[PDB]
Design a protein around this ligand. Sequence first.
Ligand code: NAG
Ligand code: NAG
Ligand code: NAG
Lengths: 50, 43
Amino acid sequence: GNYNYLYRLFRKSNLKPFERDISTEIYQAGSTPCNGVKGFNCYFPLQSYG
Amino acid sequence: IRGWIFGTTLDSKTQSLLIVNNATNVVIKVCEFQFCNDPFLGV
Ligand SMILES: *[C@@H]1O[C@H](CO)[C@@H](O)[C@H](O)[C@H]1NC(C)=O
Ligand SMILES: *[C@@H]1O[C@H](CO)[C@@H](O)[C@H](O)[C@H]1NC(C)=O
Ligand SMILES: *[C@@H]1O[C@H](CO)[C@@H](O)[C@H](O)[C@H]1NC(C)=O
């Protein structure tokens, strides 16, 4: 698998046209806070195609 | 008045736009900047 190519799997809101958010902040899916570390309701926002 | 800053959080988790005017040029740049706590331009 090539792991150099990625897509964003989760976001708080959809992009506007030609908007380009490169932020790597952990996706908080629920009431559980992330505090900069992965966990329950707290997932890395990108996936790699492989 | 010698420049402007635009963005969402204005800190390294986010992209932001900087305009600086230095009287020879207008310089414009878009980065995941870290801003100072009280930004300033030189005397
Ligand atoms: C733009 O940034 C704000 C920052 O609070 C965020 O709430 C909003 O969802 C963002 N909009 C888009 C379309 O990304
Ligand atoms: C370039 O942007 C990506 C995505 O935000 C980030 O992972 C990477 O650390 C940035 N490059 C540098 C030199 O920090
Ligand atoms: C204005 O900005 C440009 C950016 O390339 C630089 O070359 C130039 O020396 C600057 N002028 C002054 C007066 O700082």
